[PDB]
Short mmCIF file of C-alpha atoms and ligand atoms in Angstrom, two decimals:
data_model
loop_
_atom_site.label_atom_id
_atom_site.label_comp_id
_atom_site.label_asym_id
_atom_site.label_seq_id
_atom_site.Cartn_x
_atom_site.Cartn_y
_atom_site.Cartn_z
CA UNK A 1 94.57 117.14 51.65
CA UNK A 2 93.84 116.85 55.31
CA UNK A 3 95.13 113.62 57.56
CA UNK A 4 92.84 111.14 57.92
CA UNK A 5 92.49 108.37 60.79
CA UNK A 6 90.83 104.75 60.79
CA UNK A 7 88.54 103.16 63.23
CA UNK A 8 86.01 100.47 63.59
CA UNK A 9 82.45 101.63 64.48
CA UNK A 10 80.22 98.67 64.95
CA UNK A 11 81.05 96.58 62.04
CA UNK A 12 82.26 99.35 60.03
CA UNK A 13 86.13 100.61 59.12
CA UNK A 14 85.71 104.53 58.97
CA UNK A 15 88.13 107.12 57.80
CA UNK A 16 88.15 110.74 58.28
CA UNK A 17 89.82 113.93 58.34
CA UNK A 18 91.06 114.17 62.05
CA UNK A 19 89.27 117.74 62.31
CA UNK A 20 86.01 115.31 63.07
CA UNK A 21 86.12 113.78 66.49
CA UNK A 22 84.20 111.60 69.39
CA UNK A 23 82.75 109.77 66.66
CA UNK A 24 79.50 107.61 67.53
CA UNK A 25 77.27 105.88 66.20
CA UNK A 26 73.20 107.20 65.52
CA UNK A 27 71.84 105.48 62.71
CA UNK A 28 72.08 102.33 60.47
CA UNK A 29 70.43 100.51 57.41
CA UNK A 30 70.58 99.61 53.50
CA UNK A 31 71.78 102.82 52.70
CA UNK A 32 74.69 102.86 54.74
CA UNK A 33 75.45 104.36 58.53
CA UNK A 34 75.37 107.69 60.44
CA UNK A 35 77.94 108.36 62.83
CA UNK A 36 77.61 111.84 65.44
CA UNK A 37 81.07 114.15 65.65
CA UNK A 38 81.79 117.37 66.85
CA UNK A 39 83.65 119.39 64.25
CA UNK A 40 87.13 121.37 65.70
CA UNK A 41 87.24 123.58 62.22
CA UNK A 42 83.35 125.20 62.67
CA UNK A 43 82.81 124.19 66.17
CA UNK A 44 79.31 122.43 65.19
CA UNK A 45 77.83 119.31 66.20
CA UNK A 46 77.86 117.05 63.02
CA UNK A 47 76.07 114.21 60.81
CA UNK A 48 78.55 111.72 59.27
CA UNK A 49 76.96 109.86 56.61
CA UNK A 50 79.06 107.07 54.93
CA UNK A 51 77.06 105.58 51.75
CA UNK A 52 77.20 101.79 51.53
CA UNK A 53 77.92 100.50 47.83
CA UNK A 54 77.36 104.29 46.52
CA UNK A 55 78.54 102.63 43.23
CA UNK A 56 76.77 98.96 43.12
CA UNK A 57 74.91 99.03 40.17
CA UNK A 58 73.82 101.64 37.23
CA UNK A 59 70.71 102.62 38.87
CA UNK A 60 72.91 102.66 42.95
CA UNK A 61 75.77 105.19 41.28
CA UNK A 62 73.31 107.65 39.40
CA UNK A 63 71.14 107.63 42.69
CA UNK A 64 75.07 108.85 44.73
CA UNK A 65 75.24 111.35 41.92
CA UNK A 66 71.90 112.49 42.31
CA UNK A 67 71.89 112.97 46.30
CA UNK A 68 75.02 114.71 45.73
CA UNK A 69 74.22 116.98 43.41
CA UNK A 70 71.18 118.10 45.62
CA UNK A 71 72.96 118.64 48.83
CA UNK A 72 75.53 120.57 47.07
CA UNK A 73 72.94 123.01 45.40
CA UNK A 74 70.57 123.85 48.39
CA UNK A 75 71.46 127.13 50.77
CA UNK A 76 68.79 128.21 52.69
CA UNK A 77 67.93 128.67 55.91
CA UNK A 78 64.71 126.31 56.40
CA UNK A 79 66.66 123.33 54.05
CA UNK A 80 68.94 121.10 54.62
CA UNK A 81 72.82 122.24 53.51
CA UNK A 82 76.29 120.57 53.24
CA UNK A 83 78.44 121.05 55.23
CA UNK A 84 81.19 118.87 53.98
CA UNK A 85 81.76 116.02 50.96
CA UNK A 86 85.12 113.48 51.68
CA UNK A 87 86.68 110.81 50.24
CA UNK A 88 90.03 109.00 51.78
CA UNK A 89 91.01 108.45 48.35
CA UNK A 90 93.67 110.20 46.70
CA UNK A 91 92.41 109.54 42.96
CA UNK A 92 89.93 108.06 40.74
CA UNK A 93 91.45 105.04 40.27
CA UNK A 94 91.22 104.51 43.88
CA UNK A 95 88.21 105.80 44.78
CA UNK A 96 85.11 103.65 46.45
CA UNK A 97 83.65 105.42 49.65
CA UNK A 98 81.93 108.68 50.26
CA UNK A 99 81.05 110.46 53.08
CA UNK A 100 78.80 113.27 53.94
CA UNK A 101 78.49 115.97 56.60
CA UNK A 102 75.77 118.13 57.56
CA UNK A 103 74.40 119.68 60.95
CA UNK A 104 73.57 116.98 63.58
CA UNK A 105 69.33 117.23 64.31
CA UNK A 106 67.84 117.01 66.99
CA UNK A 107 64.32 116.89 67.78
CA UNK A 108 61.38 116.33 64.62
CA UNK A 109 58.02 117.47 64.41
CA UNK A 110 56.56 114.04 65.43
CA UNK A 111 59.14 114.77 69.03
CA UNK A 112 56.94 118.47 69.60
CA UNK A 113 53.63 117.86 67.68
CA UNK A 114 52.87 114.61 70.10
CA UNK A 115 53.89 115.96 73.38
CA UNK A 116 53.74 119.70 73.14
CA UNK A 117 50.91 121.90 73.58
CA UNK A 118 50.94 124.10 70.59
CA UNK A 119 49.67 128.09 70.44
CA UNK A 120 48.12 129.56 67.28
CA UNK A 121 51.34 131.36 66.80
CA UNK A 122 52.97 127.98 67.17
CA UNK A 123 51.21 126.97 63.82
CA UNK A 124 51.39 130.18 62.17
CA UNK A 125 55.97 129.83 62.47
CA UNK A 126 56.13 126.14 62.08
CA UNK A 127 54.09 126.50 58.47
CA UNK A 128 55.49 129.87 57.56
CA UNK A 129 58.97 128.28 57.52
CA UNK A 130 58.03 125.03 55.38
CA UNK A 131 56.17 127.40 52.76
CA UNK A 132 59.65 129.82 52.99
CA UNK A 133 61.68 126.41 52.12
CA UNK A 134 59.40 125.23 49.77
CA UNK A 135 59.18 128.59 47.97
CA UNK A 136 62.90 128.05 47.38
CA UNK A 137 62.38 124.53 46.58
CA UNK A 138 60.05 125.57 43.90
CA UNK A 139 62.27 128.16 42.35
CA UNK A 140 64.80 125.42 40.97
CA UNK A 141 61.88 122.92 39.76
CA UNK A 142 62.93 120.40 42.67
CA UNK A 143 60.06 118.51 43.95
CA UNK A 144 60.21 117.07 47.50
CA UNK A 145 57.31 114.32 47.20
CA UNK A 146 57.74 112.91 50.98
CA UNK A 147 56.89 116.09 52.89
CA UNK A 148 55.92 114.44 56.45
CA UNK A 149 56.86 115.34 60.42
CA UNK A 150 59.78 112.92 60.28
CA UNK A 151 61.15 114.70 57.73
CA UNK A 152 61.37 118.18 59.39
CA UNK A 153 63.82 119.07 62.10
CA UNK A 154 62.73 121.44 64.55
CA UNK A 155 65.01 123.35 67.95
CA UNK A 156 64.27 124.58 70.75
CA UNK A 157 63.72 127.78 69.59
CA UNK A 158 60.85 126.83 67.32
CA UNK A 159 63.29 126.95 64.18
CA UNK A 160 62.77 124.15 61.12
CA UNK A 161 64.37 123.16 58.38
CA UNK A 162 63.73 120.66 55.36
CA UNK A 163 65.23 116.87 55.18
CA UNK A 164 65.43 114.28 53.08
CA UNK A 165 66.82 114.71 48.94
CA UNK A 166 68.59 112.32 46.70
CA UNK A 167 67.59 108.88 48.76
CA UNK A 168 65.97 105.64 47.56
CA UNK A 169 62.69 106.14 45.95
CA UNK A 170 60.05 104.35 48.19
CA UNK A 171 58.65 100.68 47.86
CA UNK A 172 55.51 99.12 47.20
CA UNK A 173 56.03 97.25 50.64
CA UNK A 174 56.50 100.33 52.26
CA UNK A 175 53.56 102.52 51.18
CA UNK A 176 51.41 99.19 52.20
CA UNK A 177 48.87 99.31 55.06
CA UNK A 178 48.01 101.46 58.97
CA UNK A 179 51.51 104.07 57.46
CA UNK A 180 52.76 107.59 57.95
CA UNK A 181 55.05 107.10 54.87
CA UNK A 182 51.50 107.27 53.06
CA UNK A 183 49.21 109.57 54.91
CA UNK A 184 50.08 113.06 53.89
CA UNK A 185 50.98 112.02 50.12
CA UNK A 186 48.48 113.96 47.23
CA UNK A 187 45.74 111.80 46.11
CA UNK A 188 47.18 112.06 42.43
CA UNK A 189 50.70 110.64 43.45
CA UNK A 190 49.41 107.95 46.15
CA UNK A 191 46.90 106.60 42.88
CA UNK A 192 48.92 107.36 40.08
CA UNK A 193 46.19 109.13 38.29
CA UNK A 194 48.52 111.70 35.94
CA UNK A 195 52.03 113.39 35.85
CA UNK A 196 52.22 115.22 39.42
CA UNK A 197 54.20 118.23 39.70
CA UNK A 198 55.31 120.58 42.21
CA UNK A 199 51.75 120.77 43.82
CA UNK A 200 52.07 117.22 45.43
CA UNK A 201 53.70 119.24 48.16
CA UNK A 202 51.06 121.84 48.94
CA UNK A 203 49.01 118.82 49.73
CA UNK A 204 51.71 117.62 52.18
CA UNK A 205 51.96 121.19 53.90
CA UNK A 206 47.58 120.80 54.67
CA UNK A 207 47.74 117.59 56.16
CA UNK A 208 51.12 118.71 58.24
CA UNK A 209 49.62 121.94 58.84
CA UNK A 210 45.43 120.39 60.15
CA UNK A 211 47.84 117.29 62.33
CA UNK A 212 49.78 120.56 64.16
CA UNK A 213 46.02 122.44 65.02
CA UNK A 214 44.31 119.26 66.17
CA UNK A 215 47.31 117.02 67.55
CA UNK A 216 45.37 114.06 65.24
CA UNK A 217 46.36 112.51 61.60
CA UNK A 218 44.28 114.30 59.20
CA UNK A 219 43.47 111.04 56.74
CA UNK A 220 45.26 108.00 59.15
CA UNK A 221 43.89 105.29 56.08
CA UNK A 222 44.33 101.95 56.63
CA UNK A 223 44.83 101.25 52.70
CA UNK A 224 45.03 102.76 49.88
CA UNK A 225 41.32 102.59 49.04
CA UNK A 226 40.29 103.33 53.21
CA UNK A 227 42.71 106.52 52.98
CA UNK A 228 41.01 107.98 49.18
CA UNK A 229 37.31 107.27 51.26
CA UNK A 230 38.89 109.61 54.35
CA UNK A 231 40.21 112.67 51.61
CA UNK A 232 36.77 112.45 49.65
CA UNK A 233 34.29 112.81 52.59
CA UNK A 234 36.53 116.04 53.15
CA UNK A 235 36.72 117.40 49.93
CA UNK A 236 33.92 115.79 47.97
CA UNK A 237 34.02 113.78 45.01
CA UNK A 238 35.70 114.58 42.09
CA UNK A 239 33.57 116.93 39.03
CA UNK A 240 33.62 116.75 35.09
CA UNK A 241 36.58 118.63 34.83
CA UNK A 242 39.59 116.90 37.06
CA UNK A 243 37.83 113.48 35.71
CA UNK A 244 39.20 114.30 31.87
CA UNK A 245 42.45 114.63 33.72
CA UNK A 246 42.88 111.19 35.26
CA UNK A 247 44.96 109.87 32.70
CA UNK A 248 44.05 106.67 33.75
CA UNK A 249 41.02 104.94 32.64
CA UNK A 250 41.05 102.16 35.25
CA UNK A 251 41.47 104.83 37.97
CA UNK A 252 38.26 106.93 36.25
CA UNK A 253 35.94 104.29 36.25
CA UNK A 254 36.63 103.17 39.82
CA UNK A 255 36.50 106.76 41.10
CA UNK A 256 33.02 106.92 39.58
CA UNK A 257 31.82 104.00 40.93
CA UNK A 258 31.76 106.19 44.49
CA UNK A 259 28.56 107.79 45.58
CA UNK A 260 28.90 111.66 45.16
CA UNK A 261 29.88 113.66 48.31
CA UNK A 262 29.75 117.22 48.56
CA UNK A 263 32.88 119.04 50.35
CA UNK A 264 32.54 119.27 54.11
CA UNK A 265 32.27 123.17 56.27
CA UNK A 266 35.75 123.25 57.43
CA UNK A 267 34.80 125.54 60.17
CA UNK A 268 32.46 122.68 61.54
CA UNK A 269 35.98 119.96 60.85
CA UNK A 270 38.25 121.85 62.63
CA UNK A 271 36.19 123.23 65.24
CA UNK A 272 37.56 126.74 67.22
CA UNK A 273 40.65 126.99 64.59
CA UNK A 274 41.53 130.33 63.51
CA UNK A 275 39.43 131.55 60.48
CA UNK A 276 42.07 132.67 58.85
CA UNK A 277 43.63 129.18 59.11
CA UNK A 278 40.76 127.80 58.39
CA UNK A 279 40.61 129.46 55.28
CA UNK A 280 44.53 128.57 54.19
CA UNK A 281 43.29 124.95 54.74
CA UNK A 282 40.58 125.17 52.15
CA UNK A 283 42.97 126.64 49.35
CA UNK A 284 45.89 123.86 50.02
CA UNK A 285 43.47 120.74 50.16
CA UNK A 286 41.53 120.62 47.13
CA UNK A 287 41.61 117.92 45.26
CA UNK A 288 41.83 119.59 41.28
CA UNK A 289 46.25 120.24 42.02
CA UNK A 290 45.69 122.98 39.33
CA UNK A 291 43.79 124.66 41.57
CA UNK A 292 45.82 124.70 45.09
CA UNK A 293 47.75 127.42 46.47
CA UNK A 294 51.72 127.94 45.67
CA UNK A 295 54.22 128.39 48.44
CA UNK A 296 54.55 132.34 47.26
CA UNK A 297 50.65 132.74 47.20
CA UNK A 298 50.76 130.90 50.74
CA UNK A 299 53.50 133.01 52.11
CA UNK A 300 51.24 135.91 51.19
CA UNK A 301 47.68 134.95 52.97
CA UNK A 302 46.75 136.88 56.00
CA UNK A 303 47.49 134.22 58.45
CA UNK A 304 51.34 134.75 58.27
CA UNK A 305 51.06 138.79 58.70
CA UNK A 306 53.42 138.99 61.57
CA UNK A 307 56.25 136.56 59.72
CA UNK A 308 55.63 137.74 55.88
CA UNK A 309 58.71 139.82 54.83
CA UNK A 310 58.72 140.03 50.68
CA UNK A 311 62.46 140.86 50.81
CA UNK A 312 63.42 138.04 52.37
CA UNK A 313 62.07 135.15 51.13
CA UNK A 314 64.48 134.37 48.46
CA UNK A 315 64.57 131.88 45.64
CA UNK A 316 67.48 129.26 44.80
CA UNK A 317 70.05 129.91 41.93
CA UNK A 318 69.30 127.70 38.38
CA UNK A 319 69.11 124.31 39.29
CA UNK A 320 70.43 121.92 36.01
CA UNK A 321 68.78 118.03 36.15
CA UNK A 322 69.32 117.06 32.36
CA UNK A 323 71.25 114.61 33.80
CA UNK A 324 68.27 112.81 35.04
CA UNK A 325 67.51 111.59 31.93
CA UNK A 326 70.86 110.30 30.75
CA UNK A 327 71.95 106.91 29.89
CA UNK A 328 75.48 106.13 31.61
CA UNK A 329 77.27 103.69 32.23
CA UNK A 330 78.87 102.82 36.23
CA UNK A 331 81.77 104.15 36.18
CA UNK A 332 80.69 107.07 33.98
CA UNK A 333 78.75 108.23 36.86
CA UNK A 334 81.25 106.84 38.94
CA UNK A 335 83.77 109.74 37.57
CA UNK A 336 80.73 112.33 37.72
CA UNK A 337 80.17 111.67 41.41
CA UNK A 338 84.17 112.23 41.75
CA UNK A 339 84.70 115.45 40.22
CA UNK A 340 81.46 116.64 42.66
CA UNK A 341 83.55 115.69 45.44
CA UNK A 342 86.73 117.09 45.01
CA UNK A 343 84.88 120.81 43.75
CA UNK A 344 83.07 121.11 46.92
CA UNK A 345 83.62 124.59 48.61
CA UNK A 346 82.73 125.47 52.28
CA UNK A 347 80.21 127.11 53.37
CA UNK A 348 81.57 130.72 54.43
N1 PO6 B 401 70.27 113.22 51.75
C1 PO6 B 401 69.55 113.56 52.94
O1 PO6 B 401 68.47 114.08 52.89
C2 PO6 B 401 70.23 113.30 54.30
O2 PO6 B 401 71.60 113.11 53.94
C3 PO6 B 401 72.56 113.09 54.95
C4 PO6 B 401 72.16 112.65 56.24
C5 PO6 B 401 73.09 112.71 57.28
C6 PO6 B 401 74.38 113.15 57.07
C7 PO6 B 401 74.76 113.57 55.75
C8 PO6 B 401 73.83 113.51 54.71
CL1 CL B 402 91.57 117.67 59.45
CL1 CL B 403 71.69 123.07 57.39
CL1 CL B 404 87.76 105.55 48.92
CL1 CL B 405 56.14 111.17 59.89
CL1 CL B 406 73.07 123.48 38.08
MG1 MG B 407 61.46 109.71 51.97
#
């Protein structure tokens, strides 16, 4: 067990292994707080996460477990890893706080897609490493469902990786109105039309991937309804055959109420693009999710010729989520979330 030391930071009594110093604070909210550190062990700039009430309720503790269990699987270089998993206490009886370390980020997409002027080859590295994560994503039946610039770190050397797993599932409230948190989301997921899989993110990596080419939001809807009017004009109306698959009878009779719109000439959208992107954006945004373009089909196409190496692109080890659909009680998951905790090993 390492030494730990106590001190306030804004409002908050923290407690860490002395290894983790110059601790200050970056971040705050319902979830808890993030403090910055530089690391004396690896010699890395750091993330401190420290949950607030990990263990509050049922549905708060299975959501620590969850996050946990997510971090702890994913090693690769275009997602986010662990670095380290604490707890002051010195058994289960007295535990109550967790904290969490990864590498301290920088710069987002949103901090070079605004301001920078982006090349070609630009696009072609930024999108080849989100399909590379995602391909690994993929591989252990994880879905990320909020793929969006906020959510992907970039350096200065052009290098990206993956964020946000295991947090609170988003709110009505917040999915309401002129929002990011709802513009590149899949038309199936943002209407609830069926059971979305995997493919939701494909959708995500066209509207990231049309924003980065013409520095503009690809469907910037005002609602809902205004957004669905934006992503039809594009793509046209919905045939016959994705119809049967709207689950939803409320959502298949207002869809039909729409006058019938053919699919646009990309080439004429996204005017002096590379045809070859041009063409990757036709196979990722089409509306039928059976019918898009995986992350290894994508890593394939002809645009990313000069990054595409088949021997390394790898895919994650078995990823086990049965747990998702267990019934526990608090401290049940309480003790799971333990026993994660004290079996974390480094990174080498
Ligand atoms: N769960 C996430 O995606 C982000 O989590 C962390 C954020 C900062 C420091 C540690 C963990
Ligand atoms: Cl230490
Ligand atoms: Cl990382
Ligand atoms: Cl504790
Ligand atoms: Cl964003
Ligand atoms: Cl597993
Ligand atoms: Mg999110």
């Amino acid at each position: 067990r390492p030494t730990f030391y106590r001190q306030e930071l804004n409002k908050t009594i923290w407690e860490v292994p002395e290894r983790y110093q110059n601790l200050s604070p970056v971040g705050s909210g319902a979830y808890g707080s993030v403090c910055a550190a530089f690391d004396t062990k690896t010699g890395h700039r750091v993330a401190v996460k420290k949950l607030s009430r990990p263990f509050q309720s049922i549905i708060h503790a299975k959501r620590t477990y969850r996050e946990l269990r997510l971090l702890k699987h994913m090693k690769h270089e275009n997602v986010i890893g662990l670095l380290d998993v604490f707890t002051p206490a010195r058994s289960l009886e007295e535990f109550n706080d967790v904290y969490l370390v990864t590498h301290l980020m920088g710069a987002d997409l949103n901090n070079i897609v605004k301001c920078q002027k982006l090349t070609d080859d630009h696009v072609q590295f930024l999108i080849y490493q989100i399909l590379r994560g995602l391909k690994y994503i993929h591989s252990a039946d994880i879905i990320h469902r909020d793929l969006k610039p906020s959510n992907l770190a970039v350096n200065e050397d052009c290098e990206l990786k993956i964020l946000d797993f295991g947090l609170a599932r988003h709110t009505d409230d917040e999915m309401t109105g002129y929002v990011a948190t709802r513009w590149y989301r899949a038309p199936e997921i943002m209407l609830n039309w069926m059971h979305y899989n995997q493919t939701v993110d494909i959708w995500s990596v066209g509207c990231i991937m049309a924003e980065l080419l013409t520095g503009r939001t690809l469907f910037p809807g005002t609602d809902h309804i205004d957004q669905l009017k934006l992503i039809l004009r594009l793509v046209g109306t919905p045939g016959a055959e994705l119809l049967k698959k709207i689950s939803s009878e409320s959502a298949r009779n207002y869809i039909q109420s729409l006058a019938q719109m053919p699919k646009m000439n990309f080439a004429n959208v996204f005017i002096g693009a590379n045809p070859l992107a041009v063409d990757l954006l036709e196979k990722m945004l089409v509306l039928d999710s059976d019918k898009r373009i995986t992350a290894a089909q994508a890593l394939a196409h002809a645009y990313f010729a000069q990054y595409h190496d088949p021997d390394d692109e790898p895919v994650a080890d078995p990823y086990d989520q049965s747990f998702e659909s267990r019934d526990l009680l608090i401290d049940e998951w309480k003790s799971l979330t333990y026993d994660e905790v004290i079996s974390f090993v480094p990174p080498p």
